[PDB]
Write a protein that binds this DNA or RNA. Structure first.
Ligand SMILES: [Mg+2]
Ligand SMILES: [Mg+2]
Ligand SMILES: [Mg+2]
Ligand SMILES: [Mg+2]
Ligand SMILES: [Mn+2]
Ligand SMILES: [Mn+2]
Ligand SMILES: [Zn+2]
Ligand SMILES: [Zn+2]
Lengths: 827, 827
RNA sequence: CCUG
RNA sequence: CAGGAUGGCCGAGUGGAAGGCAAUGGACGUCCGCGUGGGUUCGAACCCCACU
């Protein structure tokens, strides 16, 4: 049999002894030549259908030889092209001959999904009547045939007869619908058995036709087979069983069997019976009829296996991340930008951590990277875990090199030499390559070379020169496939990519939303939880500056909360102030005003709404911009806010698509908003909450949502410390974490008890929400964090004085977390 | 040389006497068999590349015969498939054998435009190196190869030597870069000439390589050619000339020749000169190299012609109605809807006119149409003129039948029998079929039969059954192709299709525009001329009814002009009134108000804007909708309108895309809008006209723009009556025509002056603008017609009493015409 | 297509 | 799974059109032709492939 050799970072099939050279292969018998050809073609088909690999065959001579014309032609028939170089490249060393196979189709969503077939095959086993001949459908023909089937006569005059005269001349030739057959007397019955499988499917697949057995092909005479040698009823049984044995597939209901008419008619000579003529009429079949199982091969687990008929049809007709697929080029430019003239190390934070922790690692890597002038080196604690494999103790780190004039190399750094190290690195490189093709959709020639290194002071297969990354185009295509693969697993780089995907989604929505600036002066923007409301507000202020040509200090932003204004003010895109500062101080020189989280405002201090109306109207270039962002789902008190009635808040723009939280958090927000819909506060006008998230919208970003009820305070706080330490080990920064509690009065207690457990985990700085620019964790209340967001958020013990306010708290909490959310409720 | 038979409504190629049957073609000499095959294949390739047709062969025998397996296989190679049935169908009667060919690729923009090649070929003459063999690229391979080219070693050790030894073994085998060839024993220079085109193109197309002439293919021994047999310098000259004779096509700058190094090296024998060896190193070539001109054929005029290298490459590497193609399904369902169970005559106005004019025409057509139980019969004065051909006097009408269970038939009706009648009908049917395929992009099997009929007292081919329209899908696909064909010619149905295209464009822009109904309550809609402002106003009231669930009478429409008020009222979508009626009567029962042409309102009667606000913002379901449609380019007077200041007119929508006038009219509108902007009216607020139309927006609808300056009143009126009579003869209704005058005081004068000429033309009814439903030519002033549209507009002597309005009046005139605009300015 |  | 198909007929020829019952396939010394169509070869009846 054929089995993949496991010691390699690639699929490598050993086919054994093969005779190579056309002169040598001409001296073989037909049987042995065909058997060696079949082994090699099974291997090449399997590697084409499974992401590529290497065929290894032992050659019986020492000197370089050519492949042989018959093997060449079989490879050409496999790829349906004379361009062998595109998929097959051969090397030979000593007594070893290697063929390097590229994948046929790469990824779940190739560009050519409707253009080229999913699989290569040795044969499709689909036959078509092609005028007077029967021909087998190549992969492209069969692809088109099934793609068509999936969508939602004088001969009959002869067939109607109940007897035939011996020597009768039929008045029609063989044609698209007619086929005449004659057989020798002794073998007639076995010849019929072998005939049915090749002509019945061809008629069924094409439009039907008549198969006349007992008619001379050339003269069209009726001859039949002698009575003594044929039993009509046994013949009928045999033919019918052969016909029903044919494998049929369906794309419809009802899935009825092949329909045909079988007639065994009498052949009369001089008025006496001589023999029997068999006539089959084959109606056109609704779907595809195979003569047998297709001859297509794939690698699964470790065995080269043959696809079944149904699996083959499924593949020939029909976590993957489409947001990654769509944004791959932008994401690659952001994270894995290829430097022009030096080797880049990423992530820089993880690299610095590793070099600080381990002595001599810097020198080791620098010495190992001398040959590679340009490219990128991507580090990790364990690429194995990054790919959902098992971790190996003793692995300092893994690094993936993607440099010019080199193949991809996966380095594994060990503290001390190990026997299992090379196996671990090989498994990791093999998985990485298979993902780069089968998930990342890479269509080039790719290999990952596994290389173990030891910090304490089988040969590698040589690939053709076409497997080396020759420059920017290849490196960028491979890094975009790497982006798409990383977005399918949980890891530091997959989390950075997910954050950038969220940013790109927000930018799309903002481009849709910013077209209203030229159309409005007064606007009430009703956002939903996690709709980017604040990001739109900032980008709108920038757009106002650019369009109206007014200086930044002429644009004003008003919010309820000090942390939020602090955050907005540090942008230097406008003047930012609070409701109280706004109501107190004078702003006559201000032309444009933006107001956010207005539903949290209060009427105690004064009529901020009227003040802003006046300030904006008295602007010189007509009335200025007065945009009031608000979200009633995130209300923070039962009092009135000073907003005009719901019927007065016009014109309106609604931000309904969730673009700021990953998929789990978004689903949680969607579910939880129904509680607020069920019981809203009385300060909320009734009809406002009848805004619903877009049903067709998803973020396509992975995240973590964990509910950890039934725990005590010290357990919560130790768990938080453990999780933060794990993230910091994986490479996250503290400035990606925030801890949110019910009220600002409990902030001091929870800070103390968090530092009590953090002093065991090597970070001793917790900051309030009023500072967000330093590299430290943020602890604060849910409410004081309104308008801010962090990648990882710890939600501790929701609590408020009034039931009428409690329902909001879960939404106002979960909406603060971009990717990872941990909830610790009371119980 | 082959020629098209001209007596047919199709492309028919008569290839002469052909031997058919496998048993008959097996008895031939190979030369005769191959010559017959070449003739048939040239015909088939030409018909594939030229829209399809028929090949006629004369078969030497009386009885039915299969085509022959070599002919079948050549057709399979031609279409690169075994599905011959899709393109080739064969019939035979007596001593005639027909092959009906379907077009390979049809239409200017096929669905498969970028995936399948435009041409079928007998040979591409493009060769690629495939390991150790040279292979010709089929059509699909050559298509992909040319796309790739269009988008923007141990052998060298031997090659470096300057002498070799007889019997030397070259230490490397043949490979993708190396070819071993022996010299011929007989004719050496001729052999080298023969072999250079076989190998130099393949190396040049596939990365270069080495060709060693004089090296045994099997033993790899150096043999060379005897010294006395060839002369090295003449051999070099012959090789270089053969190389430079190779056709090449470039897709790049510069267009450099083929690059190579040619070496003739002495072949010693025991240290003495015995012979010569030829070494060619062929460098990779930037573009395609042909061994000879491609073997592809096409029907040009009356000749079957071969395509040149450059014509073939252009065809392979790459009026028409884009909007027709985009909306063909909707346009077909509007105009050419095919009913279930009865034959439909269209256009019915033209049909009625024809039967009224001619005695017995109804009887003739109804008699002819008995056989057909379903379909559509499309009449015309002259389908030949519709298709840009020449008219034939004596032709009553042409009808195009498209009925179930029948092929298309073009009928020509003559008053009296004529010899040229059948020729005229055949030429028209040929043009129609070729257009349906090559221009309308029909991909099925199509033939248009040509029949002549008379009102007073070569046999057509019989097409396969697949050429008859089986049912709804075939009839609809064909009618959708006819839609695209018609939209490229100037005719009555083409003008109706253009009107419906403008309606589809308006509906799309309205789908964009109507999203503001949820988001605004007060809206100022600023439309440009021809931007469909009134259509939006009507359709948005239709939407207000559905979205506010109120009855129609709750909506109020207010405009300036009585004709427009009437046109709106007669639709029963709302209550419609005038500004003057509005400012007097009671309307507080109203919830919603839409104001149109508000720029033309006047202040002297009252505060209409104040009344509108007051009525709307006191409705029960909150403030009502108050949308105001205005167009500052279409200002009719220089006084005050009563609108709020431009700085106040928010929120604001803009309709900047012209969707109501054909392309010439729209361009003329833009050119006049430029004049307005250059010299704006003073009563308009300052920044209004800085609205600009969509730069790239086009309607793709053909129209008529004619300016007949320096005419007299008599000439103008006679020309108007003459053009009206021409249109009415062609089939346009009177109610497609409007005659517009500069001022209303001239209306009765010009009514008299018009009837004075029109009574010669057999129509007696004119109408004022206040009746747009009557089937009459509307004569009225530009001012009174503002807000109304008609297909044909006659603009007479436009002018203003106050100079500023001079270009505004021209714009308000032009914008009224949908398709045909005739202007008669001042002398 | 024929024969074992 | 093997073995076949040659000129008028019988039959010899597996890589440089016998013989037998003056010639006794053809197109224009080159080429095609040994069931048909292709391929390799400097060279094919001869080797390879498909088809009948
Ligand atoms: Mg014989
Ligand atoms: Mg023999
Ligand atoms: Mg032959
Ligand atoms: Mg020969
Ligand atoms: Mn048969
Ligand atoms: Mn060779
Ligand atoms: Zn079915
Ligand atoms: Zn070039």
């Amino acid at each position: 049999p054929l089995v993949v050799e496991p010691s390699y970072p690639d699929l490598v099939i050993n086919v054994g002894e093969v005779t190579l050279g056309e002169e040598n292969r001409k001296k073989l018998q037909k049987i042995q030549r065909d058997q060696e050809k079949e082994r090699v073609m099974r291997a090449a088909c399997a590697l084409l259908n499974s992401g590529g690999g290497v065929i290894r065959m032992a050659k019986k001579v020492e000197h370089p030889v050519e492949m042989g014309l018959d093997l060449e032609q079989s490879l050409r028939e496999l790829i349906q092209s004379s361009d062998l170089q595109a998929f097959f490249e051969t090397k030979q060393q000593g007594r070893c001959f290697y063929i390097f196979v590229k994948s046929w189709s790469s990824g779940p969503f190739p560009e050519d999904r409707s253009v080229k077939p999913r699989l290569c095959s040795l044969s499709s086993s689909l036959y078509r009547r092609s005028e007077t001949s029967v021909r087998s459908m190549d992969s492209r023909e069969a692809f088109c045939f099934l793609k068509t089937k999936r969508k939602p006569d004088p001969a009959d005059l002869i067939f109607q007869k109940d007897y035939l005269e011996y020597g009768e001349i039929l008045p029609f030739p063989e044609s698209q619908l007619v086929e005449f057959k004659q057989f020798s007397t002794k073998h007639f019955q076995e010849y019929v058995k072998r005939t049915i499988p090749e002509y019945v499917p061809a008629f069924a697949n094409t439009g039907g036709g008549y198969l006349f057995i007992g008619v001379d092909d050339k003269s069209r005479e009726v001859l039949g087979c002698a009575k003594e040698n044929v039993d009509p009823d046994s013949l009928r049984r045999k033919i019918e069983q052969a016909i029903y044995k044919l494998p049929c597939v369906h794309f419809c209901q009802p899935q009825r069997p092949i329909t045909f008419t079988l007639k065994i008619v009498n052949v009369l000579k001089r008025g006496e019976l001589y023999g029997y003529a068999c006539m089959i009429r084959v109606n056109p079949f609704c779907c595809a009829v195979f003569s047998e199982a297709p001859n297509s091969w794939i690698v699964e687990d470790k065995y080269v296996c043959s696809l079944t008929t149904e699996k083959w049809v499924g593949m020939m007709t029909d976590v993957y991340s489409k947001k990654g697929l769509e944004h791959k080029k932008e994401l690659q430019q952001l994270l894995f930008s290829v430097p022009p003239g030096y080797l880049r190390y990423t992530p820089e934070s993880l690299w610095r951590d590793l070099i600080s922790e381990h002595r001599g690692l810097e020198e080791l890597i620098n010495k190992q990277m001398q040959p590679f002038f340009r490219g990128i080196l991507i580090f990790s604690r364990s690429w194995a875990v990054d790919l959902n494999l098992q971790e190996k103790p003793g692995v300092i780190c893994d690094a993936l090199l993607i440099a010019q004039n080199s193949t991809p190399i996966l380095y594994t750094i060990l503290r001390e030499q190990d026997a299992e190290g090379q196996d671990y690195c090989t498994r990791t490189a093999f998985t990485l390559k298979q993902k780069l093709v089968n998930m990342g959709g890479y269509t080039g020639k790719v290999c990952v070379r596994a290389k173990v290194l030891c910090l304490s002071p089988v040969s590698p297969m040589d690939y053709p020169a076409s497997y080396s990354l020759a420059g920017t185009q290849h490196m960028e295509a491979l890094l975009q496939s790497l982006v798409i693969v990383l977005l399918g697993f949980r890891s530091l780089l997959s989390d950075q990519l997910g954050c950038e995907v969220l940013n790109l989604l927000t930018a799309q929505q903002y481009e849709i939303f910013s077209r209203s600036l030229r159309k409005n002066r007064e606007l009430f923007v009703h956002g939903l939880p996690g709709s980017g409301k604040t990001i739109m507000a900032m980008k709108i202020m920038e757009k106002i500056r650019n369009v109206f040509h007014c200086e930044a200090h002429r644009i004003l932003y008003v919010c309820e909360n000090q942390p939020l204004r602090n955050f907005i003010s540090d942008r230097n895109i406008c003047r930012a102030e609070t409701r109280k500062t706004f109501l107190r101080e004078n702003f006559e020189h201000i032309q444009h005003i933006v107001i956010d989280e207005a539903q949290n405002f209060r009427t105690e201090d004064g009529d901020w709404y009227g003040k802003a109306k006046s300030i904006t109207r008295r602007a010189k270039g007509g009335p200025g911009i007065l945009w009031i962002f608000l979200d009633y789902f995130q209300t923070s008190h039962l009092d009135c806010s000073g907003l005009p009635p719901l019927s007065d808040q016009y014109p309106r723009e609604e931000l309904t698509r969730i673009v700021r939280n990953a998929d789990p958090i978004a689903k949680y927000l969607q579910k939880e908003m129904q509680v607020i819909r069920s019981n809203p506060s009385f300060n909320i006008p009734t009809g406002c909450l009848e805004v619903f998230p877009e049903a067709e919208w998803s973020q396509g970003v992975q995240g973590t949502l964990r509910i950890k009820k039934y725990l005590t305070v010290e357990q919560i706080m130790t768990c938080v410390a453990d999780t933060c330490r794990r993230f910091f080990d994986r490479g996250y920064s503290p400035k990606d974490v925030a801890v949110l509690v019910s009220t600002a009065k409990e902030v001091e207690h929870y800070k103390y008890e968090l530092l009590k457990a953090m002093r065991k985990k090597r970070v001793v700085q917790l900051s309030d929400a009023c500072d967000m620019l330093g590299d430290h964790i943020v602890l604060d209340s849910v409410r004081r964090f309104s308008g801010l967001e962090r990648s990882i958020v710890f939600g501790i013990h929701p609590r408020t004085a009034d039931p009428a306010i409690l329902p909001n708290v879960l939404i106002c909490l979960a909406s603060r977390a971009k990717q990872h959310l941990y909830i610790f409720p009371w119980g």
